[PDB]
Ligand binder design. Structure first.
Ligand SMILES: O=C(NCC1CC1)N1CCN(C(=O)c2ccc(Cl)o2)CC1
Length: 119
């Protein structure tokens, strides 16, 4: 019922994500010189360095907000991909599975702690 515990849990999950080779395309903002049409398709860029910086700045109130931004990383990859078989997209799907497997307890524990707080 620790309603702050999510933040360090998300820090250590981001650490694992940064160690994963599948995160390499997503660690920093998509390079617009490499992908000159990126902003014609993607309205809101997102990447794991921006998520970590937002967390570390104290600019997430909840792990749901962090989860929305991480899911945006993956939806951007799916929207930008020219193929469901593309390499960088395929890395997104594995990393998404890894993230969802790990974030589920963080969300559950936070929402439980907050329900207890408001009981
Ligand atoms: O340039 C990138 N990464 C920046 C480096 C500094 C970390 N991109 C990753 C996100 N992108 C996609 O999700 C995608 C899907 C299919 C294809 Cl191809 O690209 C665009 C390419």
């Amino acid at each position: 019922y620790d309603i702050q515990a999510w933040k360090k849990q998300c820090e250590e999950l981001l650490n694992l994500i940064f160690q994963c080779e599948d995160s390499e395309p997503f660690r920093q903002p998509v390079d617009l010189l490499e992908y000159p049409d990126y902003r014609d398709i993607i309205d809101t860029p997102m990447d794991f360095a921006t998520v970590r910086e937002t967390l570390e700045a104290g600019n997430y109130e909840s792990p749901m907000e962090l989860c929305k931004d991480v899911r945006l990383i993956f939806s951007n990859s799916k929207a930008y991909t020219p193929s469901k078989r593309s390499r960088i997209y395929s890395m997104s799907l594995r990393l998404s599975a890894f993230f969802e497997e790990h974030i589920s307890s963080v969300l559950s524990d936070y929402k439980s702690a907050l329900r207890f707080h408001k009981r």
